[PDB]
From a paper:
Class C Acinetobacter-derived cephalosporinases (ADCs) represent an important target for inhibition in the multidrug-resistant pathogen Acinetobacter baumannii. The class C Acinetobacter-derived cephalosporinases (ADCs) play a significant role in antibiotic resistance in A. baumannii. β-Lactamase-mediated resistance to β-lactams can be overcome using combination therapy involving a β-lactamase inhibitor coupled with a partner β-lactam antibiotic. Many ADC variants have emerged, and characterization of their structural and functional differences is essential. X-ray crystal structures of ADC variants in this study provide a structural context for substrate profile differences and show that the inhibitor adopts a similar conformation in all ADC variants, despite small changes near their active sites.
For example, ADC-30 and ADC-162 differ only at position 220 (Ala220 in ADC-30; Glu220 in ADC-162), and ADC-33 and -219 differ only at position 222 (Gly222 in ADC-33; Asp222 in ADC-219). ADC-162 does not contain an alanine duplication, but ADC-162 and -219 both contain amino acids with carboxylate side chains adjacent to Tyr221 (ADC-162 Ala220Glu, ADC-219 Gly222Asp). These two variants show an increase in catalytic efficiency with cefotaxime, but lower kcat/KM values for cephalothin. In the apo X-ray crystal structures of the variants (resolutions ranging from 1.24–1.89 Å), the Ω-loop conformations show more variation than in the complexes. The two variants lacking an Ala duplication in this region (ADC-30 and ADC-162) have Ω-loops with nearly identical conformations. In contrast, ADC-30 and -162 form a tight turn that restricts the active site with the Leu216 side chain oriented toward the interior of the enzyme, and the side chain of Asp217 forming hydrogen bonds with the main chain amide nitrogen of Gly214, both presumably stabilizing this turn. Overall, the B-factors of atoms in the Ω-loops are elevated more in the Adup variants, suggesting that the Ω-loop is more flexible in this region of the Adup variants: ADC-30 (loop 20.4 Å2; B monomer 21.0 Å2) and ADC-162 (loop 23.0 Å2; B monomer 22.3 Å2) vs ADC-33 (loop 20.8 Å2; B monomer 18.8 Å2) ADC-212 (loop 21.8 Å2, B monomer 19.7 Å2) ADC-219 (loop 41.4 Å2, B monomer 35.7 Å2). Overall, the variants that do not contain an Ala insertion showed little to no change in their Ω-loop conformations upon binding of the inhibitor MB076.
Residue numbers in the entry: 1 to 359
The structure:
């Protein structure tokens, strides 16, 4: 006798709402999409000092979830014939021709297997020439293609190459091509002055207000800011690629194609992929120190799972994000917070909610 919207709201209250007090989080948005129906749940404040409530207009930083848009842009360029994933970056960034990095192909950059790229660029790498110099001064370590080391500069370089192949800056690739194609109208790389009233403050571990600062290749690495409705629309696109033109549909499918495995995790383009149903510990393993912070041998796909799911965590200094979707259940979930909470808690709460929602 309890409507579905209330049943979903109860589950989110039971599993996500307690994190607000536990981690002193000022604001949170949680969205679920099931069978094309959308459910939006907002908690707390987008700005504590302004007493401004989180709502459908609130803009949050997506952190590494931004890489999903980078991956989509790459799949688009690839299916338009502008790039091949077997190309090397010096084909597009001419100053990298005949450098060591020009031995690494685009898929290997996008999926973190160059063998010598760390989590972040060096702190001192700021300007555009310093980014080029960094890649000019790059030398291999581990054999190329053998080891996955999660890396922002790696997929950042992929994004820069994608932009070069489309003859537009990367921010324009998203704002002029990819976001319009996905029907996202409240998503930005650069939030305009006329929308700053909707840009949440982020909050650091001392609950002090902050927002993301500029950095090298920030746009393809962590540059996107979006709202909960827009993120539900992005999940909807991933659940129903067949509702988009050939180019964007094929781009989305590109991002869903598993490329290799590390144990139970399939590395797709941007997305991490798993056999469904996935155990909680499979999903937690994807965010372990061993997988996130250390290099791991990759293995070829053995089981190509017919029934699968996908997820991605992302953070900035002041924000947390988690997105997950299960195609054959026609369901997905987005969590946005304006303070970081542990990845494990995001994964656990979403697992509890999605598994309890009535089919």
């Amino acid at each position: 006798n309890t409507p579905k919207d209330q049943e979903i709201k109860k589950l989110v209250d039971q599993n996500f709402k307690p994190l607000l007090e536990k981690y002193d989080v000022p604001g949170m948005a949680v969205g679920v999409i099931q069978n094309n129906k959308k459910y939006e749940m907002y908690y707390g404040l987008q700005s504590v000092q302004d007493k401004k409530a989180v709502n459908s207009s609130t803009i949050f930083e997506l952190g590494s979830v931004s890489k999903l848009f980078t991956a989509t842009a790459g799949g688009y360029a690839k299916n338009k014939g502008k790039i091949s994933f077997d190309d090397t970056p010096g084909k597009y960034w001419k100053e990298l021709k005949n450098t060591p990095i020009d031995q690494v192909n685009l898929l290997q950059l996008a999926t973190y297997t160059s063998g010598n790229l760390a989590l972040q660029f060096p702190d001192e790498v700021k300007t555009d020439q310093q980014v080029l110099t960094f890649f000019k001064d790059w030398k291999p370590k581990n054999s190329i293609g053998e080891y996955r080391q999660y890396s922002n500069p790696s997929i950042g370089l992929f994004g820069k190459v994608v932009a070069l192949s489309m003859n537009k800056p990367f921010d324009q690739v998203l704002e002029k091509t990819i976001f319009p194609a996905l029907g996202l109208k409240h998503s930005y790389v650069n939030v305009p002055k006329t929308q700053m009233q909707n840009y949440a403050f982020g909050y650091n571990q001392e609950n002090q207000p902050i927002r993301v600062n500029p950095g090298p290749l920030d746009a393809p690495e962590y540059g996107v800011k979006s709202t909960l409705p827009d993120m539900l629309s992005f999940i909807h696109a991933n659940l129903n690629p067949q509702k988009y033109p050939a180019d964007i549909q094929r781009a989305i499918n590109e991002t869903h194609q598993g490329r290799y495995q590390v144990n139970t995790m399939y590395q797709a383009l941007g997305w991490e992929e798993f056999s469904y149903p996935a155990t909680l510990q499979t999903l937690l393993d994807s965010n372990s120190e061993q997988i996130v912070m250390k290099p791991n041998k990759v293995t070829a796909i053995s089981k190509e799972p017919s029934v699968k799911m996908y997820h991605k965590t992302g953070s900035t200094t002041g924000f947390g994000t988690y997105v997950v979707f299960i195609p054959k259940e026609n369901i997905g979930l987005v969590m946005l917070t304006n303070k970081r909470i542990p990845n494990e808690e995001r994964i656990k709460a979403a697992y509890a909610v999605l598994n309890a929602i009535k089919k």
